[PDB]
Symmetry: D2
Subunit: 498 residues, 4 copies
């Protein structure tokens, strides 16, 4: 029997676990320490959540180690591992409205969006990777023969072992699902650190692993302080791989701790300042719709959000006019209300940063066209924002906002290489986009953009089958697609002489 926080909302009765999840059971942290998780729609405390301590991290790693080395997970067929992951996806689907409601409460995700994306894509992710389990294959290799004898060389793809994964707060369940599904599909066991500010869907997910019959200890979840849990996971002698998505400075530290302990494998996704280049020969009304999506989707809390729009001189003014017309139609409100287009920001500290960000944009001389302020209502709502006259040297041309702030620069009619240079000036390299009807411009621009993803006449079109990861200081390693599996596998070469 699990302890829950019960809540009647959205025509459901939510039952929310709030404790650490270690070895198939929900347990208090050492000293029964807790912290408050805050609802961004009104600033209220949702509930108290267990605050994982170093001893709890050790317990979680030990449970994952045992599950991997001696438990059922390490013994069953790849095909049967796949069956369990497909069952997990089914259980998630059965609980989809509840999960989407929890995400609306915990992260401010608009419910309709949380259903379709935060939860919907999570279910797709588990189903996709479940299909990979019995399709992960090694090789047989035609090596030179040690005549008069013969040789056979093969490779075996094997799991890496116990993994630690650190999940950001922008799409809590979805980002958890991306990493967890690939990790588990490859035969590993895992200790998951959800963001301090967004523990709840991870903990509901933990309960669903029980319902799906995932062996105890395969999944362990440790809400609490990022510095505490992330550091101990990265230092731990029994952890063999860390997957991290978060801030550049924390990621650098994570990688350093991986090095200095046991040279564990690491993948890093460290956000971006992603350019979207909009040419005068695009479909303009479509460019307005997709340009707005590129920035405002999920209240801008989106690692691949377009952090700069470069718009060709001849359509610039009309583009901005149309964006403003459409921004005015956005319905700001409670994420549980069906007419809501734009939900609150995730947490208060982030709201405060967005306010300071726009103050600085104005200070340094950009033109504030609309927004830039906290919406006058309870909770942590921020007005969709449009800046123009942004120059390359400006802070807002360089720094990632992680909010609903469209940052527009002009470029001269016909100036392809020049605008590419400005778009590529960043040390980030996560995503990018180009809008043009011209096939030659589209293909050339996609070649030249220094980013892990290039969108052409679309934006935010991720897919569980399409690898996602950054270049340069956005990190390395892929989530999603076949490529994600390689981060969670090791290759053993076996060479016979006969």
């Amino acid at each position: 029997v699990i302890n829950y926080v019960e809540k009647a909302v959205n025509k459901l009765t939510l039952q929310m676990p709030y404790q650490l999840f270690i070895g198939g059971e929900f347990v208090d942290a050492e000293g029964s320490k807790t912290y408050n998780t805050i609802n961004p729609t009104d600033g209220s405390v949702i509930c108290q959540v267990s605050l994982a301590q170093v001893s709890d991290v050790d317990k979680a790693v030990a449970a994952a180690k045992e599950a991997f080395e001696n438990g059922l997970w390490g013994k069953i067929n790849a095909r049967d591992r796949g069956r369990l992951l497909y069952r997990l996806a089914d259980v998630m689907e059965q609980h989809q409205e509840e999960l989407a409601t929890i995400e609306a409460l915990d992260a401010g995700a608009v419910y309709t969006l949380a259903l379709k994306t935060h939860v919907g894509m999570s279910i797709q992710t588990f189903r996709y990777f479940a299909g990979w389990c019995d399709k992960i294959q090694g090789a047989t290799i035609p090596i030179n023969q040690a005549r008069p004898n013969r040789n056979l060389t093969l490779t075996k793809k094997e799991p890496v072992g116990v993994c630690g994964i650190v999940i950001p707060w922008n799409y809590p369940l979805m980002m958890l699902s991306w990493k967890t599904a690939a990790c588990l599909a490859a035969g590993n066991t895992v200790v998951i650190k959800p963001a301090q500010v967004t523990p709840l869907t991870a903990l509901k997910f933990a309960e669903l692993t029980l319902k799906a019959g995932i062996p105890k200890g395969v999944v362990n979840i440790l809400p609490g302080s990022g510095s505490l849990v992330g550091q101990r996971l990265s230092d731990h002698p029994d952890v063999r791989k860390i997957g991290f998505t978060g801030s550049t400075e924390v990621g650098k530290h994570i990688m350093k701790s991986c090095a200095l302990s046991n040279v564990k494998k690491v993948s890093l996704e460290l956000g971006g300042k992603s350019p979207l280049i909009i040419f005068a020969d695009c479909d303009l009304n479509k460019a307005v719709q997709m340009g707005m999506s590129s920035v405002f989707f999920n209240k801008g809390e989106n690692c691949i959000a377009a952090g700069r729009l470069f718009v060709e001189e001849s359509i610039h003014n009309q583009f901005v006019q149309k964006v403003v017309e459409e921004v005015e139609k956005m319905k700001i409100g409670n994420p549980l209300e069906r007419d809501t287009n734009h939900g609150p920001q995730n947490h208060e500290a982030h709201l405060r940063k967005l306010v300071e960000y726009c103050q600085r944009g104005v200070k340094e001389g950009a033109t504030l066209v609309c927004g830039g302020n906290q919406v006058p209502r309870p909770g942590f709502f921020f007005q969709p924002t449009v800046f123009t006259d942004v120059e390359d040297h400006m802070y807002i041309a360089k720094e990632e906002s992680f909010g609903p702030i469209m940052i527009i620069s002009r470029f001269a009619d016909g100036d392809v290489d020049a605008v590419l240079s400005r778009a590529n000036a960043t040390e980030f390299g996560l995503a990018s986009g180009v809008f043009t009807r011209d096939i030659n411009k589209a293909l050339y621009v996609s070649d030249k953009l220094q980013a892990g993803t290039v969108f052409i006449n679309t934006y935010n079109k991720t897919d569980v089958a399409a690898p996602f990861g950054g270049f340069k200081q956005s990190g390395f390693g892929k989530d999603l697609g076949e490529a994600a599996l390689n981060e969670y596998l090791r290759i053993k070469t076996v060479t016979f002489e006969y």
Copy 2:
């Protein structure tokens, strides 16, 4: 005109460059600083070699950056990049005797072995990867369609950019070739740091890149201090990937430096304590020949050398007797002499470490069966050595010697899981081996060994098509095979809506 050290030796005239190689030219280091490279056959100074300074590292990176961003290498077809690498292999082949002679002088490699292995495998490496250039392919991926519109998603494999590679002293040209060939085949440019004690074949190789028409700046070579050059490469903001083979502590530091600078990609190969398990049902005379080679090949200076032999009780004494008989037949001497089959150790400090290693072995209670001492002749020759009665807690059971020291433990007749546990009780995981005629034992043992390579009824059977790399604290990433390319490529996802 290039400055050479000229030497008439081994029926040829050596012409050895001795300077830094930057942007297609041989140049003195800052301040014309140099150091002596020493011949391990007689302790003599071969010549003075340029000692790279920080400003020289920066010049080399700048040359590699320019070659990659603006030079011919980044413009030519993949097929034509292949042609240049195949031409390079041809040039190396035309100079095979010269290269093998330089390796014999600089590293103490027995000339006949250097010709077949150090040089022969290097030529195979370049030819193999040359063939990959126009066969590196991305994907087209069946993503969900944004109906009523359509989507196309593809991936492009692109070069990572400027790479830094740090090469160990065990097989100087060969380890250089492993990394450089995969790096260049993927379309990157490179700055190479050969071991301080073994610069000469790297510098001759550099000259050969001119003969082959590799564009200026694609290959840059910086002999000197490992701390200086390796540190600056790992710190440098324009370097995007480091490939490192060397000691665990240096490797950990390299990875830390990659993290704290610009989160550049890193691969590590950090040596091993590789177990070889010899069952009573093996072919015993063959086990003696292969077991000896597993330890003594290339005077033990071999990252995959068997660092422990576990020998089944019932054959142990006969195995040791046969080894001793064969060790006595070994011809120790000048590596240029055709009868020689055991060359000198690479450098004096390493010889002194081997002497101390065997002293510790004796002090802690292992039985010194034969060897253990410096051979009383000029140079740095060490006796092929056999220890028995080695227990798991012993220093020599845990520490990598990197010398010709066979370290034998018994295991009980019929035990399999017990000996596997002992074999796996290292934090290393580079290689391993098993000798048995029993198919069931062979397959089970290969499954259970926690190592990147498992040899069955052979040892030291590497092949340019077969990936090589470690698990656990031996590091991560592969050299050789198709898999090596992935360390030197990035994947760009391009997603269209139409």
Copy 3:
């Protein structure tokens, strides 16, 4: 509402469709023509089944064409095609006892075996291939660039279109599932011809496609005459691929008809005379168990059944003695009885051939150790049979029996190449096996056997992930594994200049 033949049997109420299945509905054949399907346990008529006419074949092809060109199947996402195929597998699982009972009645499959293998593997097949749908990927290829312009070349994997598949009678549902799952996973639509003698599980399967929500016309099933339906499918101008498993002479005709109509693609699996080589150093009791299985599994109605056993001289007599002891323990009986382990042969005409086969074996001088005759009881039961003193020139050493007839030859101690030559002296090449504890012999023999599958220390170990198909006159093309998909896809190369 669907017309059923209802039967109370095996503690179930079977509801069996008996009509053609065209465009999502069960319909009578032209002129309401029918034929009788026969229960091999007692020779009784189970029911009348529709007898497809040429006009019915055309209707089925027209339905499949419309479903492919204009229906939902050609429009939905690959991932959603996968979902439908998973759902189909789930529906099959929900009906597993009913399907297995139908197969016992129609094919004489022992119920316990039909549940685990005939039906169980069919469910695995659909789940496996469902997982492939969104993981079928094309390439991006680094072609030479038409400078000063650029080129992009990609490939797109596309469905082939309307396929005809002809299914044998030995494992009716299972063989249907092998081909249908790969065909549908690749996005094609299909017209299925089940063997005239085994229509019933195919027709129940058709009903289950309705339950699973497979769009109308995607699956069409035409029971009746093989010559009529097979010929028209192979002749039809709108069919683009035929997949055929059956007799050599029928297969050759099918391929000829594919050629002379519209050069439609074809795959063929034409049976085997598969050798099993048993060495004196094998585990003898295990060799007896697996050698028994190799011949007697599914009453020998198994395309990969071992059609010759070569047994090393020194163990031959003991092997035969042990086989006879095990054969004597086999319980022959009604497939629905739980203690039955040998069911009746599939149909009367086959039983007659088996009788003639053993008459000829005796005529030509083989030693009949046991069996060789129809069991005195109603239905079409054949006594498990063992022949020894079989010489290479004999009919029974060359011709496939497809029945429970073990055909044993000796080979001299220490011969390996000699026995291989004899094992390879067939024009068939479907499967083979070797029993030995010697790793060197196992690997050498597996290299040298001229067969599409080689079993080592096992037999009959098929798996939905492991490709199955023959060499030489056994045909070409694979069922199962990733490889099977290639038979049902085409590759389009798209090359841009920009």
Copy 4:
């Protein structure tokens, strides 16, 4: 010494073998039967060439069988097979002017084109496939385990054995090279049937295989009658695969003969009626240049030649005007004249067909804009021809000309699906093209075109890495790219229990 026909021409002394090439030697056919090969520039007899008889075909197959089963080719490492194929490419390059001259003489190939394409691409082909030899890899597959036992399942890629390949007359050496390189790279041996009308570069190639050190019998070449040699190869019990490029009716027969003999594997490329769709938003002058090349390249003797041009209504008349202007500038003449743009047709009978083809086009109502006749001058020259007012029901809208005949239809301004329907209304499916600056049209059209290759804003852009083959009645199987290898390999599944 080899017997040569010697000719002083093009600054060279050509030495042309003219005999059958069997088991490494040039030999007369049975009865010393010969036929004349004719120079299309002047109608003169070049020389007499051996006329292969059935006994000669059997001798060739026997030599290939011995070379495969017992000779060095089947024993050497894959890497060393690669080295030999690279060496062959080097030898071809050393003889490139001689080969191009022979092709000018025998096929009427314009010398400058023969150097760059006919010979140049042949050299690229051998170098490309040489690189594949040691990169052809099988798989290790995670099958369900027979607990408490374990299973290992792997695949081996193996050669198919003796192959027969039938080569067309349009690019004699190049088409030979496409097939032969992939065949040999996969480890097979081959009997090659060059077109009766174009034997000479095949026979010179045979001599070059001697110079390259290809083992005797690996390559055999049988000039003579296509019906005789092709029929016997397709019937032969020791041939395991036929690769055929040629006419539909002959291809159908070849496939029938493969079926009725030993169900040998077959690939077919049977020509095309390839549509090129030119939209008004294309770059018009470039469309004229590329549209002309799509038809007139290699005097139209090109299986992927655009056989219909659909030109959008608003640009049709200007397009036609520009084409006529450029056609008038084409230099028609001797292939050895360095300013020749348009050489003679391959042989007289083809010239006569082209004359009749154009008479039929005019008779049925198409408008002859220019050309349509033999050029009055010695040899077999045909005028570059342009037809307009071509309607979908016309013979010239359906039949492949294989000559320099541009066949133009208008399509309606702003229409896309209607023109696609018309372009797809052939039973051929080899190639296709689209010219448009609109990325959306380009991507949609490339999806919808029912052809094996789609060119976008280019034409005739084949590449040795890019697979080439048809759909529908154009055949099946690919030449070029990794995909070509699969036609020449078989897959063996090996499954162990341990």
